Each structure stands twice: as C-alpha cells, then as structure tokens.
C-alpha cells in the first residue's frame, strides 16, 4: 500500500497469485487516464512546436500507447495478466527513447515562441508523469520476480552508500575514458544506513550529478589530470528524508550561468543539457528537492533530498 | 567614492583636511533624513506595540537624535566639524543598546497582533538602516585616524582568513567557558586572498554564525565534550562576491524548526534569538545573502555571500 503522488505501489503477497490480478487491474485503471492527460499536453503545445516531425513522432507514440492500452480486454485470470505484462514490456521498450526524442524535438522549435515558461512546464509535467509511469509499470513486472530484499521495485533494506558506489564506479569509468583519470570519491555521514526505498529515481539522478561533478573537476584541473581533488559525498538519514550532498572542488557555477543551469537544453559543453532540470523535476515529483550552492572559484555543493516511504 | 545601497562612503585625501568638511556636510545632509524615516516607522507600529515602555524609550532616543542632529549648525570650518564629531560619538554611545532594547521590547508585545509579517519588516528595516548609520558615522570618525591599510573603515587589503581567525578565537573562548571545550576550526579555499573590504558587517555576522555552529556541535556531543568534530570554513573569492561557507557536524536544524529559525525572537536555548535574522538582513542590505542547508542527523552548512566593493 506504499504511495507517492496520488498514486500507490501495491505491497502484498499471495502464493496463488491473487495480488497480481488486483495490481494488473490497477494499472489498467490508471495508465490509460494518464496517457490521455499527456496527449492533451501534446495538443496544447504551441502549433509550430507541435508540428516538428520528432515532436509528432512522440505524439503518435503516445496515441498508439493509449490505443493499445484501452483495446486490452479487462483482466480476469492469470493468463490475461500474463499477456498484459507482454504489452507493458512492449510499451516500455517502444518509449525508451522518448526523453531523447523530446530533447532533439524541442531544441530548435523552442526559440520560435516568446513564452519561456511553457516548455519547462511541459517537460516537467511530461517527464515526471513518465517516471511515475515507468515506476508503476516496472513495479508490476517486478512483482512476478522473487528477489531477496525486494517487494517489487521497492527495496526493503536499501543502502545509500551501496547505490552511490554503483553509480560512482559507472561515472568514474566514463570520466577515465574521456580524460585519462577521474576524481576519487569519498562517502561519509550515515554510511551504515539501510531502509526501505525505491532505487529507480536514484538511478537516474545519482549518475547525472556524478557526471557533472567529475566533468567540472577535470575541466578545471587540465594542467594536472593525474592529480585532482576528491568529490565528497555526505549521506544524512533522518525520520523525514534522505539527503545526499555531493560536493566538488571543480570551480563553481559562474554567476552568469547560475540562472540558466536549471533550464532545459542549457549546457556549457554529458553534453545534452537535461541532467539538472530532469533531476530536479524528478526529486520534486517525489516530494524532495535538488538545490545547488555555487562557490565561484572553488566548487559546488549539490543537495539531493528525497522523502522516506510512509 | 565607494557606495553600497543608495549611499556612498567618501574615499579621498588632503593634507589640509578639506575631505573632512565635505564628508561632515554629507553626514549632516544624510543622517537627519534617515532618522526621520525611522521615526515614521515607530509611528506606524501597531498601537499596543508602540505603547510598550521600552519601545517608547527607543522611540524617544530616535527623536532626541533627530532633534540634536537638526539643531547642529551647518559646518563651515575644521572647528565646526571637530565638534560635530563629538555629537556623532555621543549618538553612537547613546544608541549602542538599541538592538537589545528592541528585542526586549518586542518580545511580549509581538504576540498581541495577528500580522506576523509586520515585526520582521520593521526590524529588518530598522536594524539595517542603523547598520548603514553606524557605518557612515564610524567611517567619518575613522577618516581622522591615520592607520595603515585603512581609508576610513574601508580596509584596502582585508584578509578573510585573518578576520575569520579573529572571530574564531573569540567564539572558541566563549564556548570553552560554557562547555569546557570547543571545536577546532579549519579554514580552506582561498586562504591567501586580500582585497578592499569593509570589516564591520563581518564583525557582526561572523561571530553570530561561529557561536551557532559551536553550540550545535557541543550540544550534540554531550557524551564526548573532549572530542568533537571540527567546524570547517571555506573561503571563495571571485570577481563578483566573497563567499564564506561555515559548515558543522552539529546534527542539523530539525525539519520542525526550519521555517522558524529565521524568525526574530525564535530560539531553542547565544540565547537571544536574533543571530540568524539580523545576519541575513545585514547581508541582503549589503547586496549579498545568507543561506542555510540543513543535513538533519549530521549538521549544517551556512553560506554567507557579500558583494565586492565596486
Ligand atoms: N558540479 C558542477 N560544477 C560546475 N558546473 C556544473 C555542475 N553541475 C552542472 N554544472 C553546469 O550546469 C550545466 C547544466 O548541467 P546539466 O543540466 O547536467 O547539462 P549538461 O551537464 O549536459 O551540460 C552544465 O553544462 C555545467 O555548465
Ligand atoms: N549551525 C546550527 N546548527 C544547529 N542549529 C542552529 C544552527 N544555527 C542556528 N540554529 C538554530 O536556529 C536557532 C536560531 O538561531 P539564532 O537566530 O542565532 O538565535 P539563537 O542562537 O540566539 O537561538 C538557534 O536557536 C538554533 O536552534
Ligand atoms: O514514456 C514512457 O516511458 C512510458 S512507459 C509506459 C508503460 C505503460 Cl504500461 C504505459 C505507458 C507508458 C509510457 Cl508513456
Ligand atoms: O541606532 C544607532 O546605533 C545609531 S548611531 C547613529 C549615529 C548618528 Cl551620527 C546618527 C544616528 C544614529 C543612530 Cl539611530
Ligand atoms: K541544464
Ligand atoms: K532566530
Ligand atoms: Mg549533465
Ligand atoms: Mg545565535
């Protein structure tokens, strides 16, 4: 019965599999309405934006998704549900490039309107409903599996340190490939903490912020790539939220860029311009936040806050 | 000709002392108008607040100050100016307890109105005009002196590290007296920096924040007062501003208190409740800011930003 924003992830067990049917019907009740909501969003886009071929592509994908979902017969038995799972999987696969297509689509078309507020509002709303969609969908699929410490996509005892480490190794590799080195990362504060949590949003955000911190460190120690300052991560765990402070000595975000870094499409180039604003939208959708503190000339502290599960 | 908020501190020299006369006339032109502005502020206070004996005391002090200032004859020669200096000194002495009297005065009387916004607005405005007053006045007096590296109260080559150190020693002493120990303080980033700057606002703010950070550290290591985590201060110096990050491992500001810590009179007790909101008002008056980042369960980062001199 664990819930986030007006939407619940179904926590429940049964040896026969009656939990699968109620979950499946929930998705069948929930998904279509929300795709429809996002189709209106496409219909309300400024005409010249909505006309861009890629914007239209994604537009069509969303209609197709609605069509397929509503055409599916109401679920009554395991064999129905099992086959609905096939459709959910197909949809996930089909829609995996959507963020990128949206980025490409809006890149040019966005300058052609005077209303700056509109695209931000559209992306925030589209991308966050989509996260909610992938969460709900991946959860249902995961409910089939019998993995240790997981009720669906909900880890019962998640380790912030362990997940940070997963993404550190990843980001370091990428950085080594581009620069020949990467900063070491140290992790302090509540390194021993374990609690119920959904990893998925951490899996988008963490690598984004790690990417940014590593780039900035390297791009400001171009004379000594072999010796760079560590990035330092602090985990704080309390009864209300989890806070992860990612703090670097990469020179800061310049005063001139400060007001634009949270803008979609804005970048100083790991070069697409979506890391910061997507991450923030995700965090706020989940009831937390993402806040920057620039120390121009020294570095940046990035604060990720996510609410605990009720 | 160095200026801050619609007001200029006079930078100039002369062996005969013609710079003193123009400065004196400036003060004579400026102070009265601004005292008058603050008298209206007293006149507009909710009646039941304005009636409190201490509030009235300060009210009278401001009238007396206006009376004395406007009664002073226009300045024409050194001997005039010299005597105006005596009056400025007297006013400074007379008004030194004003913040405290205001705190005592408003403590009870403030609950008696429904408008929470009003007292904050009154204090911010009164206390910041007063800082501007003491700055202008102390500057003029200082212009008599011939100290190295000082044009008035404007240090020509101020060292952030050195001023932080001054206030560290101070705060540590206070903390040792109360707890039997204090955290060591380390200072990193641009420790070698020197630039023109006015120390005065740093002299109010720095000890306030150092006080808060030391208390929190001790009040959360009550089992090991002999061994506490360091407070760590980071100086960043760029072309736009000076940033001083004061960061502690004192457990954070709790979610419940977070919205109230910037309120005048609010405190969890070094016990008066004015440190944070006064400091922030001062910083914003000077064109910078003061921002908190709580890591509940771990500690707090406090970010002080002050603009450089034009
Ligand atoms: N830790 C950081 N240090 C310095 N600059 C940063 C940091 N994080 C983000 N930025 C700046 O803000 C911009 C926006 O970042 P983002 O939205 O992730 O897009 P991208 O990283 O693809 O440019 C970056 O291009 C970079 O200029
Ligand atoms: N570094 C800090 N760590 C923990 N709590 C703090 C810190 N700074 C301020 N606070 C909290 O916010 C309150 C407001 O501080 P302030 O305005 O300086 O008043 P006072 O220190 O007199 O209580 C403090 O009482 C304390 O509870
Ligand atoms: O945009 C996406 O990634 C997804 S995944 C997904 C899964 C389902 Cl079951 C329905 C819609 C939908 C969308 Cl839209
Ligand atoms: O409130 C204060 O501290 C001061 S000092 C001060 C000095 C002068 Cl010259 C005039 C007013 C004035 C006030 Cl009000
Ligand atoms: K961006
Ligand atoms: K306070
Ligand atoms: Mg990025
Ligand atoms: Mg205080």
UniProtKB/Swiss-Prot annotation, chains A, B:
Tissue: Expressed in heart and liver.
Residues with N6-acetyllysine modification: 125, 166
Coiled coil: none
Keyword Transferase: yes
GO BP of this protein: branched-chain amino acid catabolic process; isoleucine catabolic process; L-leucine catabolic process; lipid biosynthetic process; regulation of acetyl-CoA biosynthetic process from pyruvate; regulation of glucose metabolic process; spermatogenesis; valine catabolic process
Enzyme Commission identifier(s): 2.7.11.1, 2.7.11.4
Chief location bin: mitochondrion
UniProt modification remark: Autophosphorylated.
Its biological purpose: Serine/threonine-protein kinase component of macronutrients metabolism. Forms a functional kinase and phosphatase pair with PPM1K, serving as a metabolic regulatory node that coordinates branched-chain amino acids (BCAAs) with glucose and lipid metabolism via two distinct phosphoprotein targets: mitochondrial BCKDHA subunit of the branched-chain alpha-ketoacid dehydrogenase (BCKDH) complex and cytosolic ACLY, a lipogenic enzyme of Krebs cycle.
Subunit and partners: Homodimer. Homotetramer. Dimerizes through interaction of two opposing nucleotide-binding domains. Interacts with E2 component of the branched-chain alpha-ketoacid dehydrogenase (BCKDH) complex. Competes with BCKDK for binding to the E2 component; this interaction is modulated by branched-chain alpha-keto acids. At steady state, BCKDH holoenzyme contains BCKDK and BCKDHA is phosphorylated. In response to high levels of branched-chain alpha-keto acids, the inhibitory BCKDK is replaced by activating PPM1K leading to BCKDHA dephosphorylation and BCAA degradation.
Name listed for the protein in its UniProt record: Branched-chain alpha-ketoacid dehydrogenase kinase
Organism of derivation: Rattus norvegicus
Whole-protein residues included: 68 to 404 of 412
